Paper text:
PUF proteins, named for PUM (Pumilio) and FBF (fem-3 binding factor), are an exemplary system for understanding the divergence of RNA recognition within eukaryotic RNA-binding protein families. Eight PUM repeats are arranged in a crescent shape with the RNA bound on the concave face of the protein. Each repeat contributes a trio of amino acid residues, termed a tripartite recognition motif (TRM), that directly contact the opposing RNA base. FBF recognizes a 9-nt motif, 5´-UGURNNAUA-3´, whereas PUF-8 binds an 8-nt sequence, 5´-UGUANAUA-3´.
First, we addressed whether the serine residues that occupy edge-on positions are required to confer preference of the PBE. We substituted alanine for one (AS/Y or SA/Y) or both (AA/Y) of the edge-on serine residues. Intriguingly, all of the mutants with edge-on alanine substitutions and a tyrosine stacking residue retained preferential binding to the 8-nt PBE over the 9-nt FBE. A crystal structure of the AS/Y variant in complex with PBE RNA was nearly identical to the SS/Y structure. FBF-2 R5 SS/Y bound equally well to either an A or G at position 4, similar to WT FBF-2, and the R5 AS/Y variant accommodated A4, G4 or U4. The tyrosine base-stacking interaction is critical for binding energy, whereas serine or alanine residues in the edge-interacting positions permit binding to different nucleotides at position 4.
Numbering used by the authors: 168 to 569
The structure:
RNA sequence: UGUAAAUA
């Protein structure tokens, strides 16, 4: 910190004015000091004369090197964000040259700033506050090569991609959907902790739900196309993603969203059907199997039920069947509980049994009677287990209501 | 009895 601005105790002075700092040429020393930048952040929020704004503009966002030094700084990045907001609120003659220059600074250093803990906040701020036409040019500065994978899986930069998805029209970031849909890229990005949030946010934005009713028809076509490109890649690697520690959330998200119903159905048939017993015994995919049971259309649900009750040859020596395996399995037991809960919800009115022009009530009662007979016959072994006690209780609570 | 995001 500069000595001219200190007391005889070594502390910063009170009664210090913004203009003294701006006139001193020492702003950069204040902006990276906690006490200095705290002073600047309060001063910058008050009434500013035209010349004060002018100095802040040239000293904070006017030269590329100091702008980057401040943007990547623990304290400075906050001052940068405030001065950008003031710049956007000041419609003087130099407005346009200020905003284009800000676009050029960030554009030339887009990748490095995205991956920085502090500069990625300057990017996120600019994307949602700048004029949309300039914000779109920032998006265009994103890399199209291996760096984009790194950006998606970065603990900081993944939030830049999600911000783009939230506040920029799809036409400007459609290249990201096609980048991510390329099979090798999709594999790397969905099987990563941060990348899986990225893919899920994209899918949500490409979904024709109540949050997108404001799109034009043309924009809905654009959206539907990008959605179908991505769902085609997701459904081709569907087994791999369903069993992965992070990507299983993407499959669950698709399967449980009614506004993705046609993709729910492709996933169930392409990936889960004929593999229900195997996937019910997987740590991560057993969650996907639960979502499938909870949200399948009723004629697929019938096939899923029939696969569990009758799809597998019993063990040649013991006669154990799929239901026997699943009820006592560390993950499969949660899928049987889900099947039981669906059936008790149906017969008690908690779940609508009318679907495609028919009341499937008779089918839920069939499946329930199967579970009830099994749980009755095996009640002694089942009562040794928490899951088993819960099914016995679930059936006892049903006959109490009905 | 079973799994997921970063600034004073």
């Amino acid at each position: 910190l500069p000595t001219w601005s200190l007391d005889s105790n070594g502390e910063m002075r009170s009664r210090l004015s913004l203009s003294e700092v701006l006139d001193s040429g020492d702003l950069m020393k204040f902006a990276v000091d906690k006490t200095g930048c705290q002073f600047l952040e309060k001063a910058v929020k008050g009434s500013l004369t035209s010349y004060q704004k002018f100095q802040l503009f040239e000293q904070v966002i006017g030269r590329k090197d100091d702008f980057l030094k401040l943007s990547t700084n623990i304290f400075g990045n906050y001052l940068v964000q405030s001065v950008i907001g003031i710049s956007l609120a000041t419609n003087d003659d130099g407005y346009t040259k200020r905003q284009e220059k800000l676009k050029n600074f960030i554009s030339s250093q887009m990748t490095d700033m995205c991956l920085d803990k502090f500069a990625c906040r300057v990017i996120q701020s600019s994307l949602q506050n700048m004029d949309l036409s300039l914000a779109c040019k920032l998006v265009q500065a994103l890399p199209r090569d291996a760096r984009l994978i790194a950006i998606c899986v970065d603990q900081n930069a993944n939030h830049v991609i999600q911000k783009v998805v939230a506040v920029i029209p799809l036409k400007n970031w459609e290249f990201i959907v096609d980048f991510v849909a390329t099979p090798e890229h999709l594999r790397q990005i969905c099987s990563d902790k941060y990348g899986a949030y990225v893919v899920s946010t994209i899918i949500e934005k490409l979904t024709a739900d109540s949050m997108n009713v404001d799109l034009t028809s043309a924009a809905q076509n654009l959206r539907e196309r990008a959605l179908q490109r991505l769902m085609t890649s997701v459904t081709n690697r569907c087994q791999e993603l369903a069993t992965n520690e992070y990507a299983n959330y993407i499959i669950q998200h698709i399967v449980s969203n009614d506004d993705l119903a046609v993709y729910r159905e492709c996933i169930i048939e392409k990936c889960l059907m004929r593999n229900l017993l195997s996937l019910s015994q997987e740590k991560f995919a057993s969650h996907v199997v639960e979502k499938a049971f909870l949200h399948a259309p009723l004629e697929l649900l019938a096939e899923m039920m029939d696969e569990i009750f009758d799809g597998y040859i019993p063990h040649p020596d013991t006669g154990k069947d799929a239901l026997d395996i699943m009820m006592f399995h560390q993950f499969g037991n949660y899928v049987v509980q889900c099947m039981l809960t669906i059936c008790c919800d149906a017969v008690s009115g908690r779940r609508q049994t009318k679907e495609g022009g028919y009341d499937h009530a008779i089918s839920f009662q069939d499946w329930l009677k199967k579970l009830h007979s099994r749980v009755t016959k095996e009640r002694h072994r089942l009562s040794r287990f928490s899951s088993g006690k819960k099914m016995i209780e679930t059936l006892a609570n049903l006959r109490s209501t009905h």
